[PDB]
A paper describes a structure:
Calreticulin (CRT) is a 46 kDa soluble multifunctional protein that was initially identified as an endoplasmic reticulum (ER) chaperone for monoglycosylated proteins and is also involved in Ca2+ regulation. Similar to its ER membrane homologue calnexin (CNX) ectodomain, CRT is composed of a globular domain, into which a flexible arm-like P (proline-rich) domain is inserted. The globular domain is made up of seven concave and six convex β-sheets forming a legume lectin fold. We have investigated the CRTs of two distinct parasites, Trypanosoma cruzi (TcCRT) and Entamoeba histolytica (EhCRT), for which a pathogenic role has been proposed.
Numbering used by the authors: 23 to 211, 294 to 349, 351 to 366
The structure:
């Protein structure tokens, strides 16, 4: 039911790409401030003004035929991020050493910010193109840990959770540009006979084989935690309570590091 859970207690099983000789360095770390010196540990990007590209393979490939698929992970931008990504990717069969921005993914999911620009990416590869989510939700611009959870249901509905709470909810067909128009001209009532129905929008075209972090950061220091993937929503949200729902401790740790200032 839970296919995968990266705790980032270690990073040896994650492979860093060879597509460039200058990808940024990463480490296991709890950051400058933390709710717990051990449980707050995670994947930390260390170097300013770098690209990052590292990945790990699912022990077993992941499918979602007539079944739910739930993705969750957290990013902590404690560094005062002005420009940088904090999103992950789910990819079909690929070579981790040539992993880069152009590598074919099925899903690109997570926070991204640069200047006054801010949104949560939910990008689905469908029918040979990457389809950007039509809705634009800004993620919280603070130094605290935030969790991003996505439910892709077998009825082609979806739901996006930020910090455990529902932020967006709707239909894949309506909130992305995946299919042709149902009407030949909108509001005419005349059907478009070329329209093709797809009951498998939610379904991965090929089985999913890797998770990867492919981001650019100007101000580095971000920490990734708890990459969870499964087929049951409550199960994942329960796991988010266990791992993230550290809230009270972290916020107090943040105030402590802010009273000094
Ligand atoms: Cl997007």
């Amino acid at each position: 039911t839970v296919y995968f859970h990266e705790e980032f207690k270690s990073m040896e099983h994650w492979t860093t790409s060879k597509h460039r000789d200058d990808f940024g360095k990463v480490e296991i770390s709890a950051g400058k401030f933390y709710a717990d010196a051990e449980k707050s540990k995670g994947l930390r990007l260390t170097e300013d003004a770098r690209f990052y590209a590292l990945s790990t393979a699912f022990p077993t490939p992941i499918n979602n035929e007539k079944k739910s698929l739930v993705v969750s992970f957290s990013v902590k931008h404690e560094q005062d991020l002005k420009c940088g990504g904090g999103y992950i990717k789910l990819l079909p069969s690929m070579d981790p050493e040539k992993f880069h921005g152009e590598t074919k993914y099925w899903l690109m999911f997570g926070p991204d910010r640069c200047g006054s620009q801010n949104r949560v990416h939910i990008i689905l590869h469908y029918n040979g193109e990457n389809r950007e989510w039509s809705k634009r939700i800004r993620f919280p611009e603070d130094k605290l840990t935030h969790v991003y959870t996505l439910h892709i249901a077998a009825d082609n509905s979806y739901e996006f959770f930020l910090d455990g709470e529902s932020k967006a909810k709707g239909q894949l067909e309506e909130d992305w540009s995946l299919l042709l128009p149902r009407e030949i001209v909108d509001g005419s009532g005349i059907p478009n006979p070329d329209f093709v129905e797809d009951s498998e929008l939610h379904k991965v075209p090929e089985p999913l084989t890797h998770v990867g972090i492919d981001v650019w950061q100007v101000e580095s220091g971000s920490i990734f935690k708890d990459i969870v993937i499964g087929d049951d929503l409550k199960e994942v949200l329960d796991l988010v309570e266990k791992t993230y729902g550290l809230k009270k401790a972290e916020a107090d740790a943040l105030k402590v590091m802010e009273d000094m200032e």
